[PDB]
Symmetry: D2
């Protein structure tokens, strides 16, 4: 497939009540291409006043007796399935927009990101008419049952590293349960989300069920967090903004909260593993999506006996990583999202040598035709150094040493984060022991970054509150109501 | 059954690591009998230092390879089952302790509160080895499964209206899932929980699994809520404090939060209801436990056809209610918990009269000692009155009239709260339409109020976050870890 | 829509391994149009040799590493959803094939039968990748999980009264779980099932996953029931043949068996019901599908106060029911399936008049072409009559009379059958008491033949084994495998 | 613990309606000690007349409105909890009965058999009030929920190899779901079951809920399997008799059938496994309970490289196995159950010698009295040999050679049986490939004969129909009733 050539950006306005509207203040804000630096377009900037309109529209579409409430649960799924069909029809345009806006290689935006979006809508389309309550054999002459009702108006805030994918991961389970949504994409990458607005309207979704409001964090996002008319907020982003999100809920209307926060997730290679396979997977586990992942390997604990040739094979392939333009079919890695992320990544690369790390290859040195950075491999890293404790979100791979299994479990777990973790080995005892000992939400064995629409995903500890994906992602978007009926006499 | 004659309070110390300790500061605080105002005993006052010692003991009991972590899940249930046997053996002592400390009539504490405690422990004893994960058929060559593991150290804060029952509601699901507990009972009523510590040690729970720290809210409670070594907080209490808990959790260590906050629960009576039965059930809905239930049917809506007779019957029933000493088997209504509650109820009663409501009976304090209040009935109450919008945790009944089902549905839902609701009718269509339309976590039909170990209990809107009781109470105390293994072929 | 004129029957051969084949013997059998009595076409007759070829093809399509076994579960679902798209495409063709072969009014076949077929495939298309096993916290140092695997080759035998819907209800959950199918449609109505094989081929199911073999009962069916290479048989039909089915399973393979057998289902109407609504619901409860529903409410119990009035409206509606050609848009009732069924009905109608029952209308045939029977209403029926104890698969409505609730529960439950029951009342107490006291797998309250793609069926006592539809229909088509892995220590 | 001194057999009568009855014919049958051939006692022999009295008592106890049907689900669990306490109190007496009557070593009965009995009753005690139905979001204005009710009278027939444990596995899930039971223990071993009748009465079960009828297969057993008033039969577990059970059920009243039939279970030892550990677990997998487990165990496939060393170590262990009196604390292996089994094993041992297998050890009977057989090991066994097929319910080990995993999977699966499989390896890929490929209801990895109350147990193919143990064991003893209520509006 090919990136669609002269791609007009047709949708740049605010999406409220299935209508395109200008910002209340009149302001707009620029969207940028990270592969050059040229401004792509300008998008209407939502602020608090725009959020108040989106919430009023979402509340009306959720009122009792509305089109969205009375709709058969199975027809909720048919709409989600039809959204997947429209995305598949415009898969090239959407993937082109994702390479243009986020700087991802087009061929993996087409075959990875867009596939996960299509599969997510298809997967949750089947769940809509399969969300069950229960009947309970209760004491006394009573008949007790539960209903899994939708919570209501849901505010959703998503980052920039997977704009279209995170958009699907948020609205698909929310709409599957019958909620209405006010979602605010990252200010850096709002375009694919806004294009989804036209697909949502084309699919047949009732007005006000999904409202897309592009804007900045402290303005439009903080308006969502403290809004008294939003029943539930789903936030995916940094830990510190997550603490603000949690505080805003308790301060305002005690809205229900889930936070996906990521962390410094370990990657454990053992001597038993196939080195050719472990090198490539731990490479993709940290370098994929220009390293801007929280599942990112970052730390790579390698056993004593294989540490040397592991680094040898890492830098070997890390030097063939074809950096270049996203629209080029040869490009493996595109540029970072913006300058500030392109900057504070290089502070930490300079911090690596400033604390004593054998910088093998890497260090940054690409023609500034964009926001590109040279693939970097550090070694002789220790738990003390700053590059081991804070996340990088860049093509920086840090390799460490370990001897005992018991020492690598403590070293991997000694972290207030804990989103994911990986183990590479063929011993079944050590694979089961390490996986069961990890304080992380997802543990991969002999693989990395293997996400699926069917499997729940979330973080332990401070990285954080809640679960997404799979069936368990639906519990986040449902409210349990118990009904107890007095009956003349109970039997059975 | 009779009250324990010369009830000595044997356990007045802080319970950490299965050992009775004095407070780090040496302070004690008094405990009073609300029926006479006399001081019953003094109890060691836990503060921040004692909380810190409890958390480190609870954390040590939860570390890998400990007795509580290595113990069979079925053996966790054996311990909860043994605890229920000990509560059953000392049922009269604990009921007398609840009556003397809390003012509940002894027969009600024996047959209602103590029965709920025993059935709660026996219920969750059976859940321990039945908490199941799932295996998921993901795309590709993968074997994906999930584990449901304990959260960690759980901080628990409970109020004074059902001291022993709230104690069991909190620790039973937490222990069932394998966590450890630091629990702070209300400063008004710490005696039942301290006696449970002795039963906890007698049953054979490992040291540090349950730690009980009697103390005050701003000192002991706030230290629990802001502790960075506590993974999860479960709070039951006022909405104003509940806001401070969710806030302090976000700015500290992003601990998971459970809130049970209650509300202003409506009770709808249609003309096609067993009038004599509805009068009695709505009478118990307000007056049970001295009106100090969050499920209190504060606003009783009556259809206009039966309004005058329902008022006349409710007033006669309220004039017959026996207020007196809790130890007297004739007593139906004990005192309020303290002078703070007593004063806030008397002021609200004054507000109802000043705003035009018809004081049908009562409205004044009873006697000179204790905190007894006359059973009070207000008629002609409208939605805008203060007594109709504010929670009166006291023996005050409020009767409002309505005309149509759609009118009473909007009025009953018009509330920041949504904990509980009830409808009394013999029409199946009215019963199902109203129960489906209520914005409340529990809806009762022709009853008030059937709670049970099997039925989930929570609230909509600002009445709480999450659920207690039943299977769904377990989900608050487990965290999901997803494990994905790369496999050679996969055969579906 | 309109019936496709001069419909050409194109598929008349045996469908094995996605190939149309002739009989191994060469024999063929005729298919008739029961509205005009003459021959539609000729269809290949499958026998033991042909079933053997089907089983061998189904066994190969299920072997390890095959396309069907290696297929992602979500891709099994998209195949089922493509099949629903195709059925929707040829909807008017299949409805015309169902009116022509089965005598159903075309609009009823279009808007009811095929609406259920499409929704059934779409519903089970969503279940394919959501069949979850479980992980269990067993005692000892063990990790235990379960896999829900397909059983294997499933033999399926269906009757003639809902040929396309029966076909869908059988293969949809079977394919959803990953099984392969050898299905034998009723010899009276094999056409629409054979057309499905063309849609199966077009949708892209692997060869041999579905094998459709038209033939006769004691030949093709008995070969299926006794075949040693078939893992599970699913039979829907008469009770007597069902006894032969389970005997063959025990005599041969110990294959898993589920049966869907007769009904003689009671319909209970109380005086407080809306008589206009109940008269029509209980009228469709008997007369729908020419009275040839196992769920027929052939025992209408009416409260004494409304009996003679209920009889009058039931009589007036019966004489108004338009009987005629199914292709005619004004036709409500078509003909019976064949001559054998036509004779048994009249021999039971004459059984009622030879005994005490009062014949209010109809009672005889209509002409010569087709097997049309007048809409018939019997009054004053008692439990002793043959007409109240034997299943009448015709348009014969019997109206009994009762006085008390305890009486009608006793009379309704007095039956070796127990597939279905209905209650019409606005009182919640007698609705819940009667519905709980019924000995039937489905109880309808203030409705009747309201089946859905969700919600199980049948199926109590001698009326069935196991359940179809809903999630529980999947339980019949999976086998549990427990895997226990020894681990070093185990915690949590 | 030591065997009960002398031990009197006090309960030798038929247990019906909580009363001890004589046989209707007055006949008794002897019970023997298999270690000495001497007669222990005589027991009333139940026949068709006694079964009819038991079914009548079981039907009345199941009557609507009876104590057993009105009892809270939680109180059904309390009774199971009390029965476990009584079994624990009399653990030594029941262990001595199992040893004296069944031939098991006393310490094995005490620590293995009765531990399983106690844990089984305790496990299902917790399930009673946790059997949940579901509420279903169906299309249209409908409210649909399911109730899981007891089936009714459950006939149960169990074997002699694990008398008390089979008794608990049968009645615990049946009583947990609220059924009533008519159970026939094996004629060889009725003593433990009859003693349980005394504890059942002492625990406080209502009369007629459990009825224990000692007798023979063709008399008492065949009357149960063909009884018209029995709703469900659960059988265990000879395959030949299992065919008669499923056939008689279809011929009688189409009662529901669960079968737990035999097996020739493989044990696959790979080269990369702990050899000393695998030799011992494969030894116990064959020789435990005198080789009288259907979870044997017989066919041990060993990889070629370790074949001869595995064989030598297995012979060394077999020559050391201590055979002698069950009461002697040093005994590892008691006698066979009776002369019929004794002769059956010696016959098959001759078949192995005549067919060319290498008799490395054993092959003869031990002593002149009892039914002791030397621990016997066959090497150089091949698939075609008679001993490689055909269940040897005795202390006979057979060791087969293999290379390549694909070969051993095809050979281990080459069986009409499919109850159990095991694999010993440290490679996670081999362990997961084999366990997923095995056609068996239970696969063990690096262990054998684990088994717990929490994990379901059953057979593939002709090894059984359905599942016992775990949550899935409850699915066999419940009937799903769907209730659908038409509602006015319907919202999410
Ligand atoms: N499937 C399992 O879980 C399991 C467990 C243990 C043993 N077994 C099987 O038990 C068998 C050993 O005992 P067995 O050889 O005496 O088999 P068996 O079937 O003859 O004996 C078991 C029971 O079957 C009953 N029985 C015998 N004939 C009957 C008939 N015509 N009608 C009704 N009931 C009849 C008897 O009451 C007896 O108690 C082994 O073959 C083994 O496979 C199976
Ligand atoms: C063929 S069977 O289905 O009749 C059967 C019966 C018993 C066992 C068995 N065998 N062992 C065993 C123990 C030690 C050694 C050794 N060394 C070997 C075997 C333990 C068990 C067992 O069931 N435990 C158990 C525990 C708790 C609950 C419960 F319900 C059952 C295996 C198969």
């Amino acid at each position: 497939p090919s990136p669609t050539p002269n791609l007009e950006i047709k949708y740049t306005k605010i999406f409220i009540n299935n209508e395109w509207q200008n910002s209340e203040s009149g302001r707009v804000f620029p969207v940028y291409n990270p592969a050059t630096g040229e401004q792509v377009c300008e998008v209407q900037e939502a602020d608090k006043a725009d959020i108040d309109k989106a919430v009023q529209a979402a509340r009306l579409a959720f009122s009792l007796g509305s089109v969205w409430r009375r709709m058969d649960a199975s027809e909720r799924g048919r709409l989600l399935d039809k959204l997947a069909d429209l995305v598949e029809r415009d898969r090239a345009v959407l993937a082109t927009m994702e390479s243009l806006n986020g700087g991802k290689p087009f061929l993996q935006a087409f075959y990875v990101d867009l596939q996960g979006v299509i599969k997510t809508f298809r997967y949750y389309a089947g769940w809509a008419d399969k969300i069950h309550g229960m009947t309970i054999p209760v004491d006394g002459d009573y008949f007790t049952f539960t209903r899994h009702e939708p919570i209501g108006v849901c505010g959703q805030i998503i980052p920039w590293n997977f704009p279209l994918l995170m958009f699907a991961w948020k609205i698909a389970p929310a709409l599957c349960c019958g909620n209405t949504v006010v979602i605010k994409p990252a200010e850096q990458t709002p375009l694919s989300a806004l294009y989804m607005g036209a697909l949502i309207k084309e699919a047949g979704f009732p007005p006000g069920v999904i409202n897309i409001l592009p804007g900045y964090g402290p303005t439009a996002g903080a308006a969502i967090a403290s809004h008294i008319g939003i029943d539930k907020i789903a936030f995916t982003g940094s830990t510190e903004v997550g603490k603000l999100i949690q505080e805003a809920a308790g301060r305002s209307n005690l809205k229900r909260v889930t936070l996906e926060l990521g962390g410094k997730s370990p990657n454990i290679i053992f001597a038993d593993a196939d080195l050719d396979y472990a090198v490539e997977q731990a490479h993709q586990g940290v370098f994929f999506n220009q390293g801007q992942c929280c599942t990112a390997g970052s730390r790579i604990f390698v056993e004593e006996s294989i540490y040397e040739e592991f680094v040898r094979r890492s830098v070997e392939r890390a030097k063939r990583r074809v950096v270049g333009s996203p629209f080029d079919p040869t490009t493996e890695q595109g540029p970072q999202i913006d300058k500030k992320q392109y900057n504070k990544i290089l502070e930490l690369i300079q911090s690596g040598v400033a604390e004593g790390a054998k910088l093998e290859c890497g260090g940054k040195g690409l023609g500034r035709k964009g926001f590109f950075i040279e693939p970097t491999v550090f070694s002789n890293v220790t738990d003390d150094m700053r590059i081991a404790k804070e996340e990088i979100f860049g093509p920086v791979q840090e390799i460490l040493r370990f001897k005992t299994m018991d020492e690598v479990i403590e070293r991997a777990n000694n972290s207030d984060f804990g989103l994911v973790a990986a183990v590479f080995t063929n011993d079944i005892n050590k694979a089961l022991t390490v996986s069961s000992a990890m304080q992380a939400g997802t543990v991969w064995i002999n693989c990395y970054n293997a996400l699926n629409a069917q499997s729940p995903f979330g973080g332990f500890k401070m990285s954080g509150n809640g679960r997404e994906m799979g069936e368990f992602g639906l519990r986040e978007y449902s409210e349990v109501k118990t009904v107890t009926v007095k009956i003349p006499q109970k039997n059975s």
